[PDB]
Amino acid sequence: QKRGVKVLKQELGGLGISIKGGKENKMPILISKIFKGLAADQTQALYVGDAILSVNGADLRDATHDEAVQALKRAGKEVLLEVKYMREGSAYGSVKAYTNFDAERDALNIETAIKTKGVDEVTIVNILTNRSNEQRQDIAFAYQRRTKKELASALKSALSGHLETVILGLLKTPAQYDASELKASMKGLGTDEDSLIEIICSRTNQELQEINRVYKEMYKTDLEKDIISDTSGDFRKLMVALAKGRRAEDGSVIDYELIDQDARDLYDAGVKRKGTDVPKWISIMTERSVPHLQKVFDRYKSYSPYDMLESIRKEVKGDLENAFLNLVQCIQNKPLYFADRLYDSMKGKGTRDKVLIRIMVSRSEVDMLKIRSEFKRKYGKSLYYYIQQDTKGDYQKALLYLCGGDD
Amino acid sequence: TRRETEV
Ligand SMILES: [Ca+2]
Ligand SMILES: [Ca+2]
Ligand SMILES: [Ca+2]
Ligand SMILES: [Ca+2]
Ligand SMILES: [Ca+2]
């Protein structure tokens, strides 16, 4: 959305911004910093990550760094910027960026909340669950700058129970959270295959590329190597292939001939023969793009008397079956996949808090709004309602904030 | 190049 912002230069700082990039960096001219208390700050209309397309009519779309600097420095007192937020994100998350964000004020209020007698969890929850993940990182930075202590450690001491689990999860970057959840699922004598499957089967190529990098940075070992240590058989081969994050990207053309051939190959490898050609299933379901596989699974119904999910249940068992079932759901309808997992986490006696928390934290800035739509459509009551009946206290309030509201 | 320039 191209928008126009008028900035009045001040003799201290000028526009009061810093810029990055240029065509020699294969980047568009991007606002990198907005200095507190300067010209562009007082407009409250520009955000870090904005692409400056023109300055008083002077086009900057194909400008180098120096070309943009000279154009920005030359412009008179009144400056009209045509900007366009080019930072990629999702419009279907429930947690949005707070519109009056002050990282120092939040850090100071969180310090006050922690030091208050009995701890003011309400304020801590009201702040952190109503800031984007990027804003939380800025709060963590300002907290360390003012108090000289790390925010995550301070909150771990102040909080306990499920509330601590939610808050500490919210403080990690998305890749950090997934990496630490993957490490947790491969800790001790046993293995949490359900949690391992949920993350590996649902994460995209871009998300997995970042997880693989951050995992090695955090634990000094490759994620694939830890997967190999804690899994075996065809389940290992499927998990290792998926975790590589090298699925084919969604192309422009629809390959109908390959859609039909994949459908026949999936049929020949399973329902048509005794046993299963598991490597063939792994190759097709890990290499093809998601839109392609959606059409493959429908074309598969033309050849097989059972659909892909029912075919998996009849062909394989154990962890391998659970992996394929989760993967196919993520391909067909990922928001419905998470809606169903949320329902299973609460429907019965007690709560599967680990799963409930992990989904509310990890999907809150991705597709929580679609999850909520699928949930309300299938179960008749909102996700908000189900969280209300299964959780209590400040833990409940934090989850309700992450939910975002009723349906 | 993480080159920044103030303007
Ligand atoms: Ca308290
Ligand atoms: Ca604690
Ligand atoms: Ca283990
Ligand atoms: Ca068979
Ligand atoms: Ca329950």
Residue numbers in the entry:
A (entry chain A): 109 to 515
B (entry chain C): 143 to 149
Task: Give sentences from the paper.
The human proteome comprises 266 human PDZ (PSD95/DLG1/ZO1) domains 16 and about 4000 putative PBMs, defining a network of one million potential interactions. PBMs are mostly (though not exclusively) C-terminal, with their COO- implicated in binding, and are classified based on position −2, being respectively Ser/Thr, hydrophobic or acidic in classes 1, 2, and 3 17,18.
The logos of PDZ domains SNTB1 and MAGI1_2 indicate preferences for x-R-E-T-x-V-COO- and R-x-E-T-x-V-COO-, respectively. The oncoviral PBM of HPV35 E6 satisfies both consensus requirements hence recognizes both PDZ domains. B The affinity-weighted specificity logo of SNTB1 PDZ matches well with HPV35 E6 PBM at positions p0, p-2, p-3 and p-4, which display favorable contacts in the crystal structure of the SNTB1/HPV35 E6 complex. Accordingly, HPV35 E6 binds stronger to MAGI1-2 than to SNTB1.
